[model samples]
Target: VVGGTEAQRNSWPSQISLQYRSGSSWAHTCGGTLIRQNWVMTAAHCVDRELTFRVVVGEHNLNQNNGTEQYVGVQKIVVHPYWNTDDVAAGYDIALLRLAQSVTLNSYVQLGVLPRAGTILANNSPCYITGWGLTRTNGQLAQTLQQAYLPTVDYAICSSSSYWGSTVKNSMVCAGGDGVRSGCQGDSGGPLHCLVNGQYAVHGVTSFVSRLGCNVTRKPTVFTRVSAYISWINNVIASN
Candidate 1:
């Protein structure tokens, strides 16, 4: 994330690092949220390359052992059937990955709570975006996880001509258009946790940012609305 700080170790227990094998070592490519003992939620574009992917839960530092990390191979990748790899603006950018083995939950690792179906946050709701994405546009990945406070921007304002315009859709949530702090490359598929009522829940799956730059004025980070796919997620987990 651009203009972000290192996240507290226990602040985001459900955050995960989605990695792919390099020549000799694995590298972080995207971020995901652990939604079940053996399932992860991320963006479809993160797995578009068809590389061998793995999920690392309880991961805080990417360059060093955190002692709490749990590595597991991906057993199955279930991208949204309606997702279009080339047309992200059309929505349906979400995907789920099944783990080869179930992971045990602890203070450092747990399942993310998802919003109820069709739930929409009011304007400027309290929220945060967490990931190991770039600290700046086109910059190298961070050695540790980071987070930024990105308040919610309702669809009406986000889809307005001055903001994301036609690119933003009701199926998406927009946050952090302040031009200083926002999601960058490598942050895709991470969680946009928002505080609603009295609890925090996963409200978004990081989707896209302005093409102009990572932190651009009037161009907030766009995410797949998790509430919009509650039924689909439940069916996938139940039938898979």
Candidate 2:
């Protein structure tokens, strides 16, 4: 995230590191949310490559071995059928990863709560984008998890010509157009935690940002609205 702060330890327990095997080391590529003991929700674009992938739960610092971490291989991957590899503006950029084994829950790791179906946050609603994405545009990823406050920008405003325009869809949630704080590269498939009714829920799956830069005015970070795919998510888990 650009202009973000290091997230406090265990503050976002559902946060996970989605990594890929690179030579002799594992590289953090995207962030994910643990929605079930064996299921992880992320952006379809994150797994577009054919590289071997794994997930790390209870992770805070990417460079250090946290005692609470649980490393698990990805047994299966299911990307949304409508997810076009080329047209990100078309939306439906979601994916589910089945873990090889179920992870144990603890203070440092737990399942993420999903928002109610059809739920939409009001304009300016409070939310945070957490990830190990870059600290700046074209920069290296952060060593530790980071979060940035990114209030919601209603569809009406986000889809206007001044903002994301025709690129933003109803199935996507737009936030943080202030050009000060936003999600950057390597943050894809991460969670957008929104505070609602005194509780926090995974309302978004980080999808895209402006092509011009990570933090840009009128081009808020775009996410796949998790609430819109509740039925699809359940079906994928049931059949798999």
Candidate 3:
């Protein structure tokens, strides 16, 4: 995230590193949220490729050997049926990954709390975007996880003519259009945790940023609204 601080090791217990096999080593490609011991939630676009992928839970530093990390193979992935790679802006960008094995829970690894169905945050509600994305547009990814406070940009204002216009939809969430701090490259499929009722919940899946740059004026980061797909998530977990 551009204009962010290095997040503490345990600040985000549910954050994960979605990696792809690159040559002889695994490379971090996107961020994810651990919703269950054997499942993870990320954007469907992150796994659209046919490359071999694995999930690293309890990961903080991508370049370091954190003994607390649990590397797990993705047994299967179920992307939202309505998700279309050609039309990410139309929403339905979520996906669920079933893990090969259930991971051990620890201080650094825990299931993320999700908002109740139909939950929507007030405009400018407190929230944070955490990931190892770039510090600038087309820049290097962070070795340590970074986080920035990004209050919610309500749908009414986010879809204004000067902002995202009609492309923004109710199934999406927007935040941090200040053009200073925003999710950049490699941050897709990450969590957007929002503070509500004295607790934080996974409210969004990082979907897209402005085409102009990582941090662009009036072009806040767009995300797939988690509450809008509660039923779909539950069904995928229960039936799969």
Pull out the clashing pairs in model 2.
none
Candidate 1 Cα outliers beyond 4 Å, as residue runs: none
- List residue ranges in candidate 3 displaced over 4 A: none
CA lDDT, every model vs. true structure:
0.95, 0.96, 0.95
Model 3: lDDT to the true structure: 0.95
Q: Residues 1-240, candidate 2, lDDT per residue (tens digit)?
A: 999999997899999999999999999999999999999999999999999999999999999977889999999999999999999999999999999999999999999999999999999999999999999999999998999999999999999999988999999999999989999999999999999999999999999998899999989999999999999999999999
Pairs that clash in candidate 1:
none
Q: lDDT tens digits, residues 180-206, model 1? A: 999999999999999988888999999
Model 1 / residue 113 / CA error / Å: 0.1
Model 3, TM vs. native = 0.99
RMSD of each: 0.6, 0.5, 0.6
